[PDB]
Design a protein around this ligand. Structure first.
Ligand SMILES: Nc1nc2c(ncn2[C@@H]2O[C@H](COP(=O)(O)OP(=O)(O)NP(=O)(O)O)[C@@H](O)[C@H]2O)c(=O)[nH]1
Ligand SMILES: Nc1nc2c(ncn2[C@@H]2O[C@H](COP(=O)(O)OP(=O)(O)NP(=O)(O)O)[C@@H](O)[C@H]2O)c(=O)[nH]1
Lengths: 417, 178
RNA sequence: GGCACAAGGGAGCUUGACUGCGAGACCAGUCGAGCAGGGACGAAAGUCGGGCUUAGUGAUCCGGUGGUUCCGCAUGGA
RNA sequence: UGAUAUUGAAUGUUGGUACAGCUUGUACAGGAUAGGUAGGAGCCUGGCAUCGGUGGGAUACUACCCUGGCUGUAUUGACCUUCUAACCCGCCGCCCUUAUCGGGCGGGGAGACAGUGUCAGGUGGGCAGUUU
């Protein structure tokens, strides 16, 4: 499929153009550093029903070398490299520095000029012929002007389950993902906050395709009073809604922090399969009964989720990394499973017989409604008599009658009707 | 090792020869926003200026001293040929057309652009006055006298400084190479 | 329930599937001739803001969606 | 855990910054794969030189700032290893004085550390304000 990439110095509204191409994916803010740290992928079409889009960060002379490397890598796969530049400020030395790479790149290049929001000063498309490229074009993300001609200029050169990953910042999420698809795809830095939004990639494993997304970490709500840079957290929360398997990552060197329990709450309340994951065993000791020290401690603190399997692996030394997916596939089935109506009812009155302590609440019927998560409805004389202690009791029996491992369960109650 | 004076270097670039005395000046991109690039008429001062005048503006262009104006479009004569001569100026109406239709001014340094005072409605006043962050400026000849290049470098430096770029902070002066 | 001259189902034209108000009704909104410019058209007449009627998440607080003498700080610049 | 002040000297290591003086920047082509950025007015002191050249860049020589390095100059920083003079003694002797308070004068021990005043995370139902 065709590949198209956008490059240039920062603050030229590259991500703005990328978004109005389709939807609203990349975060759009106005500041010199607030650029997309790495490359992203998407799909597009204009009368060809087939195109792909790639967005990167700004290029200049903190960390900028990794962004430059990503921009260079994106220049490889792209068929045409839309090269967007400001119009109001004319040209710049950094523009020539950017143009040097394109000069050394033997691929077709289309030049575009942004910040042309009205007709009159649209006539400012001049002096860009010195760059050595073809005819420039006008575009404005605020009003979507000149889009058809630009897309025609691009066209003239025309030739599965999703699982997420969350956690508190600086626990190795980015290192874990790029040490798993076995390549460099996302950035890794010592300072917290390296990632700035969701990164999506697709891949096939054991003749099965998969989708993996990173979420740049999550910190406490109270102390997140940043300069709208926490606007990315909304993007991270969005990925959970589109994901169906959630991987929570905890550091092994550090103990269980209170914020980790809160983060795991969001996944549980969303009715999504969870697999608790811990990283960085290279720091703390690996020995006998050190397995159970954190294995037991997690159970004591993380009571609300017990179905989640516990996996240990360190991304730095690549120990037991290949064991992550075996957990994932098993969790995939249990989140979408139905049990027979006959069998499910037969188990219900066995539980209530040995516990005849529900006037007295009456159980009459039981069945399943949804596949994911497995919702069940029980017809009773009155749902007011239902007690949260007894409601939890029903869940344990169901979770013990069958496997139902690594997935939450919800029980609904209906009146006599 | 020694930085000479202005009154000594004009008499000494007589001796650095009929050659042309030119000035380099290192400016102080970060500052591209307030960059320093430009042209000004000169005091102590052969070109061939060809104009792209449109409408009535050709009628005052043929009497000021220009060599060839045109038949309102000779970019087709520019295509496959066109030994360009000295200087290309234009007017703010056909500039957009000449820019797109003309595809031979980028790496040749004659593309009309109204940032330089060369694309305007005053074509009669424009013919008569033309005849990494660095600026080059020809101020004159070897055969000029000692009092000519002093006013020439004074006028060009006052033009540079008159234009004290925004973000004036930090040193503005780095080097003068006569 | 109902549309036979069809309230399917299509398009050549693919927007009179747009432009300024609106007498007058029904019910907080909705309906509706007239109707001023320009006319999608159709050859001319003439039609004219599309799924039948049809529930389709929102005030509180009020934060984006299109820009302009739209304006006053001692005046002028922002 | 971090800064900052209280807060010192010596040598050893030791970077950064600034000002200097020398070097590098690999263009099909092109005078050795010996830079962009203003170019075009010289040999014969062993050699051979001098236009110009598919070249976007040759200089029959006039004539600026960069980029990475190498040498000096100053600034400071980071450190180690010491010392001593603040700062600290619920250690000893003497005097206030008859006094397990306190304060002076001597020894000793620690010594730029700890302790103290203003700025980040976690911690932890530590203790409050709260309603569903
Ligand atoms: N007036 C105006 N502003 C625009 C336009 N397009 C973008 N901007 C402004 O430019 C800002 C920066 O754009 P953004 O897409 O965030 O660029 P970026 O995140 O730096 N990505 P990149 O560095 O690759 O260019 C936006 O916040 C917006 O205010 C436009 O057409 N008109
Ligand atoms: N000891 C150890 N260190 C690791 C491991 N994985 C990463 N690190 C280091 O710890 C830091 C974590 O980097 P990163 O993957 O970006 O963690 P993150 O910030 O939580 N992810 P993101 O960048 O997406 O926000 C980096 O400095 C990395 O070098 C690991 O398995 N063990």
């Amino acid at each position: 499929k065709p590949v198209v990439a956008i490059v240039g110095r920062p603050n030229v509204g590259k991500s703005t153009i990328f978004n109005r191409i389709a939807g609203e994916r990349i975060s759009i803010v106005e500041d010199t550093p607030g650029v997309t740290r790495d490359r992203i992928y998407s799909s597009a079409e204009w009368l060809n029903y087939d195109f792909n889009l790639i967005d990167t960060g700004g290029i200049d002379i903190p960390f900028l070398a990794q962004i430059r490397q990503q921009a260079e890598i994106a220049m490889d796969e792209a068929d045409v490299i839309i090269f967007m530049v400001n119009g109001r400020e004319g040209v710049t030395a950094a523009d020539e520095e950017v143009a040097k790479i394109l000069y050394r790149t033997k691929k077709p290049v289309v030049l575009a000029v942004n910040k042309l929001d009205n007709t009159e000063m649209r006539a400012n498309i001049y002096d860009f012929y010195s760059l050595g490229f073809g005819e420039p074009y006008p575009i404005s993300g605020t009003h979507g002007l000149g889009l058809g001609d630009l897309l025609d200029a691009v066209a003239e050169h025309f030739k599965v389950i999703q699982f997420c990953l969350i956690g508190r910042p600086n626990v190795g999420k980015s290192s874990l993902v790029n040490a798993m698809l076995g390549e460099e795809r996302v950035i890794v830095s010592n300072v917290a906050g390296t990632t700035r939004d969701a990164v999506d990639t697709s891949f096939t494993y054991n003749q099965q395709e998969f989708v993996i997304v990173d979420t740049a970490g999550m910190r406490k709500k109270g102390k997140v009073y940043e300069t709208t840079e926490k606007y990315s957290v909304l993007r991270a929360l969005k990925a959970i809604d589109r994901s169906e398997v959630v991987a929570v990552v905890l550091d092994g060197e550090e103990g269980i922090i209170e914020q980790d329990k809160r983060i795991a709450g969001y996944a549980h309340e969303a009715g999504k399969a969870v697999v608790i994951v811990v990283n960085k065993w290279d720091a703390v000791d690996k020995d006998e009964s050190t397995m159970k020290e954190f294995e037991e401690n997690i159970r004591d603190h993380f009571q609300f989720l017990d179905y989640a399997p516990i996996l240990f692996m360190s991304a730095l030394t690549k120990k037991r990394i290949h064991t992550l997916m075996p957990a994932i596939i098993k969790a995939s089935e249990n989140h979408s499973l139905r049990v027979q109506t006959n069998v499910l009812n037969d188990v219900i009155m066995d539980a209530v017989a040995m516990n005849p302590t529900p006037s007295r609440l009456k159980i009459y019927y039981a069945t399943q409604v949804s596949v994911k998560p497995p919702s069940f409805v029980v017809f009773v004389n009155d749902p007011e008599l239902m007690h949260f202690s007894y409601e939890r009791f029903l869940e344990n029996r169901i979770r013990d009658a069958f496997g139902f491992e690594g997935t939450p369960i919800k029980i609904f109650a209906r009146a006599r009707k | 090792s020694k930085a000479y004076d202005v009154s000594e270097a004009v008499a000494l670039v007589k001796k650095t020869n009929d050659a042309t005395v030119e000035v380099a000046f290192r400016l102080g991109p970060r500052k591209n926003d307030q960059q320093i690039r430009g042209a000004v008429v000169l005091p102590n001062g052969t070109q061939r200026v060809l104009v792209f005048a449109k409408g009535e503006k050709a009628k005052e262009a043929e009497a000021a001293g220009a060599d060839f104006v045109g038949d309102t479009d000779y970019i087709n004569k520019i295509q496959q040929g066109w030994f360009d001569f000295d200087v290309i100026v234009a007017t703010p109406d056909m500039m957009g057309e000449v820019g797109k239709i003309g595809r031979v001014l980028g790496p040749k340094g004659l593309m009309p652009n109204p940032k330089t005072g060369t694309v305007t409605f005053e074509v009669e006043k424009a013919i008569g006055e033309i005849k990494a962050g660095n600026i080059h400026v020809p101020i004159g000849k070897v055969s000029f006298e000692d009092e000519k290049l002093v006013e020439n470098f004074t006028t060009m430096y006052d033009t540079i400084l008159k234009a004290k770029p925004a973000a004036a902070k930090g040193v503005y002066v780095k080097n003068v190479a006569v």
